[PDB]
């Protein structure tokens, strides 16, 4: 299932901006609902769960998928937090959203689900597609000569392209060199709390 | 302590401590109902709990409590007994599921929606 409710509600409830570009969050920093001014008791478990909820609502991933990603991270030899962040950022939806071909995570997910890309010359309609090293993400002409893709490729001035992603020209052929790292991702929220929570 | 004693005899489990006499571990069972009456809880809580003696098909006789507000079952009815726990009732370790074979759901219920056999209103 895919989330359909308002994202600003969750952003205000958690206290951090999940979509990045939004004014409702900064206009109403208090949690939504009839009780947004009540003092909430500080709880380690509460903060640990809020971190995971922020990550989930920002990356657009289900709970079972997040649990599987955490399990794979813990199974990997590296560190749990960085491995989880890497396996979550390696998704095709977030990759194409950070490459500049999409404005919002929801739009990137919708586009990658509608089948508007060509991974190594093969079609794909799964946002959970985990890219690998030296992978190429192309775009078909039908989805290239359209309006949304043109606007997304001409408005490439929101954020700079990271070190592990690159645009090889006007074709918007996304190229990846290696897997992302902590310094290359630079996620606002940390991962130690989420790891300690999932390691209960 | 005394590894020799441990090798000789000792270090055994205490007991299995069977929770309920489920008769081969049957979560939900049925049977005949009789004497649908009311019982009084302990002194810390004064009320009237509607209970009934149920003779299950496993050749056993227990006392089951009907959860909810209005019970529809009566003498010689088909109910679905399950394993429960009622602290206020001393000696009751079984409950009845509403809306399984002959019981009817509670009226004006739109919050629980899972227990008491509450259906979805249109």
């Amino acid at each position: 299932a895919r989330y359909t409710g308002p994202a600003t509600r969750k952003s205000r409830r958690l206290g951090v901006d999940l979509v990045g570009g939004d004014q409702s969050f900064e206009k109403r920093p208090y949690p939504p609902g009839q009780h947004g001014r009540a003092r909430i008791k500080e709880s380690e478990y509460r903060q640990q769960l809020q971190e995971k909820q922020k990550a989930r609502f920002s990356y657009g991933v289900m709970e079972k998928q997040f649990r599987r990603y955490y399990e794979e991270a813990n199974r990997q030899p590296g560190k749990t937090g960085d491995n989880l962040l890497r396996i979550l950022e390696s998704r095709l939806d977030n990759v194409v959203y950070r490459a500049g071909l999409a404005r919002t995570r929801r739009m990137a997910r919708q586009l990658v689900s509608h089948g508007h890309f060509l991974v190594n010359g093969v079609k794909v309609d799964i946002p959970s597609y985990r890219v690998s090293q030296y992978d190429i993400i192309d775009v078909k002409e039908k989805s290239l000569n359209t309006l949304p893709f043109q606007i997304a490729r001409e408005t490439a001035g929101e954020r700079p392209i990271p070190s592990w992603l690159q645009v090889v020209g006007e074709r918007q052929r996304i190229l990846v060199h290696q897997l992302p790292e902590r310094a290359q991702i630079d996620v606002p929220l940390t991962e130690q709390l989420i790891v300690e929570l999932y390691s209960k | 302590p005394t590894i020799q004693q441990l090798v000789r005899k000792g270090r055994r489990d205490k007991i299995a401590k069977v929770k309920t006499a489920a008769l081969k571990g049957s979560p939900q069972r049925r049977g005949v109902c009789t004497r649908v009456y009311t019982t009084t809880p302990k002194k810390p809580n004064s009320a009237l709990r509607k209970v009934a003696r149920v003779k299950l098909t496993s050749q056993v006789e227990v006392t089951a409590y009907i959860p909810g507000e209005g019970h529809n079952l009566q003498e010689h009815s088909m109910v679905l007994v399950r394993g429960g726990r009622v602290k206020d009732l001393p000696g009751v370790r079984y409950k009845i599921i509403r809306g399984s074979l002959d019981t009817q759901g509670v009226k004006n219920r739109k919050q629980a929606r899972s227990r008491y056999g509450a259906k979805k209103e249109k």
């Binding site: 590296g78 749990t80 790891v195 300690e196 390691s199 | -």
Partner: protein, 198 residues
């Protein structure tokens, strides 16, 4: 605990140095019987320490929660405690035994995360440990668990310290992996120092 993040119209409100990571374990009401009626009190179990590893526990006693918390903070600041560390983890596995609290602590690799009970996790987060393991085996309490953690930390010893005590140089006491971890931690500390000074 309430109405603390205010802005008074006075000169100073309490802004100073010593921004240690203060953490409360638990607060319970204590009653005393007298000739007519009962008198209530508040006991606070505070832990104050710097992110470097210097920790200190306190036990404040008053008739108000803020006063008890302040007394505990002052007691912790007065009675400090030093703890050895290798980068971000404990030195060696230990098992501290308080009156009834038996807290066993074990090291862990970077990126694992601290795991312990309430008071144990509180004191460890207040300390400079981030990736270790700990378990309190019984006594179902908080003050005893804190004292057991303090005893476990006291039972620790630095590598160079134990080497000088046994009369041997380096590379003859610490394993190769532990020595490499210590060298990496020292390099990281030197890099932090030079990047903060320059």
């Amino acid at each position: 605990r309430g109405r603390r993040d205010d802005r008074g119209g006075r000169g100073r409100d309490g802004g100073d140095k010593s921004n240690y990571i203060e953490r409360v374990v638990s607060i319970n009401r204590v009653s005393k019987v007298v000739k007519g009626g009962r008198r209530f009190s508040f006991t606070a179990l505070v832990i104050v320490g710097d992110g470097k590893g210097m920790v200190g526990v306190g036990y404040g006693k008053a008739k108000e929660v803020p006063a008890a918390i302040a007394k505990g903070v002052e007691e912790a600041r007065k009675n400090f405690f030093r703890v050895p560390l290798i980068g971000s983890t404990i030195t060696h596995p230990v098992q501290g035994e308080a009156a009834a609290g038996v807290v066993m602590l074990r090291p862990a690799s970077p990126g694992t995360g601290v795991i312990a009970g309430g008071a144990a996790r509180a004191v460890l987060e207040c300390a400079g440990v981030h990736d270790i393991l700990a378990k309190s085996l019984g006594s179902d309490n908080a003050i005893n668990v804190v004292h057991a953690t303090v005893a476990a930390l006291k039972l620790l010893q630095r590598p160079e310290e134990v080497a000088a005590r046994r009369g041997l140089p380096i590379e003859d006491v610490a394993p190769a992996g532990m020595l490499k971890a210590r060298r990496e931690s020292e390099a990281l500390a030197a890099a932090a120092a030079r990047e903060g000074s320059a």
